Every structure is written in structure tokens, then in C-alpha cells.
Amino acid sequence: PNHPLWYTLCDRYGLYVVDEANIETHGMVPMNRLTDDPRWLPAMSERVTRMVQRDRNHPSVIIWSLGDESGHGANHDALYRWIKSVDPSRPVQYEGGGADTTATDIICPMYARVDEDQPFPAVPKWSIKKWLSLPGETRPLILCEYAHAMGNSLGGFAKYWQAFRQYPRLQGGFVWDWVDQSLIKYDENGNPWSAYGGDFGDTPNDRQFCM
Amino acid sequence: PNHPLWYTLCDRYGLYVVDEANIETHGMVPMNRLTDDPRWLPAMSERVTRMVQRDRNHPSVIIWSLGDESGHGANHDALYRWIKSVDPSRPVQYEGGGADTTATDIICPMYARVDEDQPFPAVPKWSIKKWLSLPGETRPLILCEYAHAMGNSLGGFAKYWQAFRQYPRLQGGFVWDWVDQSLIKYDENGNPWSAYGGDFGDTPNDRQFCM
Ligand SMILES: CC(C)S[C@@H]1O[C@H](CO)[C@H](O)[C@H](O)[C@H]1O
Ligand SMILES: CC(C)S[C@@H]1O[C@H](CO)[C@H](O)[C@H](O)[C@H]1O
Ligand code: NA
Ligand code: NA
Ligand code: NA
Ligand code: NA
């Protein structure tokens, strides 16, 4: 959840918001180790429930999200239903565990390609065009993340937009991401320069991946 | 319906057969002028019912078809339901009126392209990949006719097969068609040659379109 003024500005200027619970357990092995564990349900529940209690009156918020990259655990299904019960006015989405689990109203993959399948075991990233028509599938698809804009990037961006415009159930996505997470450091003469991972003696680090 | 031995040979050699009623009203304006007219229901009904009565014990017959290029009329709906009632063992298909009407269990377009939409009013031929995922659509898609093999043709055939293999609900199609409808004529010297439309003094004619 963002600084409260963010929603006020989105209400007034006009932007659709996905408001997202502060839950990410990316580094766990497997990713759902905590989210499938009932002992972590209390802690997870408060990150979801308290977000809804704070932000449910903002018109800019159109979609709730259970968090990010925490696999798919029974705790997600429980909190999905909690939101659906408390606030019927907004769809709930969540990408973890393969982007099309029972904890999501929207097929919301990250970095699924337009035409190319990436058939990873357990959590495949189908071509988005293919994903829509999988046997029994009926939901809209909106990429929670796509077109990773790291450095000299956004190659193939037009391929997404051609597809979004051709397929009714391909309803767009959220580019990753808005702003480089570089930090200011200063040389011996006080001149500022942009620093990334590792530049503060931080180790292990993931270098320029913050930008 | 074919010569009765055909089905015997398909039973024994092993070919899947679509058995199709002898109903085609292509030249009507609009195409459904007779098939939507209850006056023509009796004539139509016999072409469907007597086919099913004849061929229903052949294992090679896996799908019933209500005919060809006769638009979509209420008579199709009645006869679709008749077959479903009398023979639940086989899906019923029919392409007329846009290939995805209430008279077909299978989206069965003719000459719909792989990636390119052709958005004709009333009867669009969507990209087959796009067609599968239209809001609310869940049926399998098998082209009743594709890859018109007229003369030096079948360019882009590989594109169909790539899509068939990638998409579960794209379950293939029927090439148009098997054998040139040329007829043997003889010249002044009694030498045989292959003839097409118009070569018998027949007019109006559609020339080489029979091949
Ligand atoms: C590097 C991948 C295995 S994880 C990948 O890292 C990215 C780096 O910017 C983003 O954080 C994405 O959300 C994440 O899926
Ligand atoms: C020419 C189109 C307007 S109709 C087109 O003609 C073809 C000619 O071989 C085939 O008969 C197809 O079945 C038919 O759709
Ligand atoms: Na769209
Ligand atoms: Na990053
Ligand atoms: Na297929
Ligand atoms: Na022909």
C-alpha cells in the first residue's frame, strides 16, 4: 500500500489503481513455504485486511491484489475469499503460483510473451494469446508485469499492443516499471552520481537490476 | 452422403469421417432464404434424418454435418436438435451463418486465416487463434475447409500446422480439397485432355474453379 496521498491524487487526476498488500516472500524455497503455512495466516491476513479497511473508499482503486511473488498457498485462497465477501465492488487478482490460480479473478502473468510459450514445469508462462483459450479458461488477461524496461530495452513493445488491440480478452498490462531505483552518491569534489546495487558496500547484491 | 462402400472402407482402413447431409443452397439471396423458411423444413428434414438412419452404425463417422453453405436458418436449429436427441454419440457441426451459431458443437469456419482477421459484416472470419478466445466462447475449432489447393497453391500451410500444434482447442481442419474435378475430353486425333468449366459449351460457368 502506498503513501495515502497517492490515492487522493489518482482519484483527482484520473488513474486506475491496483492496490496491493505488503506481502512478498520471493526468497523462500519453495516460494509458497510461508503462504501455505497456517501459522503465517494471521500475519498475512492483517496486511490484506488493514489495506482494505484503509483504502476501500477511493474510487481510483479498481482492483485489489493479494501481494506479489509468494507462490500460491492456502492462505491466499482464504484472503481472496475474505475480500470477495467484504468488498464485492472490486475484482481481486494475484499472480503467484502460475498467474491463473483459484485466488485470482484475472489471469495476471508477469513477462508472459505474446506468441512464444515458456512451458516451465508447474508454473508455465504461456503465450498470452494461447493462455486465453486454454480448455475451460474464461477470465480476462492483464499482465501484472511486462516489457521489463531495464537499460536499453522495450524491444518488441509494439507486439504487445497489436495483440491487446486484436483480442478482446487481452486487456493490457502494467509495464515494469516507472522509475529507476538508483541512489545519489558523491565524488571527492561533491559531484553527484547515480549508484546501484553494491555501491554502498552492500553484499550480496543484485547490481543494476534495481534500475 | 457418400456411396455406402466408402464408409465400409473408412471403418476398415481407419479414417475419421464427417458425414454431411445433401443440403446446399449457396446461390440463394440471402443464403438462408430457404433454410429459414418452414415450408422447406420437410425437404431439409429428410436429407438429415435419412442420412442418420443409414449411416449411424459406422464407427468411422464421428461427426454429423447439417450440410453446407445454406446460411443459418431456423430449420438448421430444429434439425441440429433432432440429431442430438436421436444420436448423442456424435457431435453435430455446421458452418453456415458464421461458423459459430447455435446449430454447431464445433467452431468450423471455412478459410479463416491463422493470424489475420477478416471482419465481414454479420459473418466475420476471425483469426482462428482469436476466435477461440472471444468473450464467452468455449468450443473447439476445426476448419471444415482451409488451404484452398487451387493450382499452384498451399502457400502458408505450415502456419496452420504451427497454430494447430500450439493451441489445444485448435484441433485441425479439412483441406479443400482432395481431387481436381477435371473431365477427360478428346481432340481431333482422339488424344485425351483435361477439361474444366465452359469446355462443354456450358454457360454461365466458373472455369478452372472446379480444380
Ligand atoms: C530475475 C528473475 C528470476 S525475478 C524478476 O526480477 C525482476 C528484476 O527487475 C523483477 O523484480 C521481477 O518482478 C521478477 O519476476
Ligand atoms: C469463391 C467464393 C465466393 S465461394 C468458395 O468457392 C470455392 C471455390 O472452389 C469453394 O467452393 C468454397 O467452398 C466456397 O466457399
Ligand atoms: Na483487448
Ligand atoms: Na528490479
Ligand atoms: Na491443437
Ligand atoms: Na471449387
CATH value at residue A16: 3.20.20.80
Domain assignment of residue A14, given as a range: 1-211
Q: Give strand ranges (E) for B28-169.
A: 61-65, 92-93, 141-146
Data resolution in angstroms: 2.0
Provide the number of structural domains found in chain B. Answer: 1
Q: With a 6 A CB cut-off, is A19 part of the ligand 1 pocket? A: no
**A4 Cβ partners below 8 Å, 6+ apart?**
A54
- How far apart (Å, rounded) are the C-alpha atoms in residues B178 and A112? 40
User: Within an 8 Å CB–CB cutoff, is residue B168 touching chain A?
Assistant: yes
Q: Which triple of cell numbers denotes residue A35?
A: 503462504
CA distances (Å), B78 to each of B25, B50, B83, B161, in order?
17, 15, 9, 35
- How far apart (Å, rounded) are the C-alpha atoms in residues B113 and B150? 17
Q: Which triple of cell numbers denotes residue A188?
A: 571527492
8-state DSSP, B198: T
Q: Which triple of cell numbers denotes residue A160?
A: 504487445
Written as one string, the DSSP assignment of A49-90 is HHHHHHHTT-TTEEEEE--BS----HHHHHHHHHHHHH-TTS
Q: Helix, strand or coil for residue B121?
A: coil
- Short-list A128, A135, A127, A209, CA closest to A176: A209
Q: What's the one-letter identity of residue B82? A: W
User: Within an 8 Å CB–CB cutoff, is residue B139 touching chain A?
Assistant: no
- Helix, strand, coil abundance in chain B, percent, nearest 5: 30, 20, 55
In sequence order, what are the beta bridge partners of B194? B184
Q: Which triple of cell numbers denotes residue A57?
A: 473508499
Q: Helix, strand or coil for residue B67?
A: coil
- Short-list A116, A117, A164, CA closest to A142: A164
Nearest CA in chain B to A119: B166
Torsion of CA B190, B193, B195, B200, to 10 degrees: -10
For chain A, breaks with the C atom over 2.5 A from the next N come after: none
Q: Helix, strand or coil for residue B21?
A: coil
Written as one string, the DSSP assignment of B43-71 is HHHHHHHHHHHHHTT-TTEEEEE--BS--
Pocket test residue of B94, B108, B118, B176 for ligand 2, highest count of atoms within 8 A of CB:
B176
On the question of a cis peptide bond just before residue B30, with omega within 30 degrees of 0, the verdict is: yes
Q: How many CB atoms lie within 10 A of CB A126?
A: 25
Residue written as grid cell 459406422: B58
- Short-list A178, A100, A98, CA closest to A138: A100
Does the CA dihedral A36-A177-A179-A49 come out positive or negative? negative
- Short-list B166, B169, B200, CA closest to B183: B200
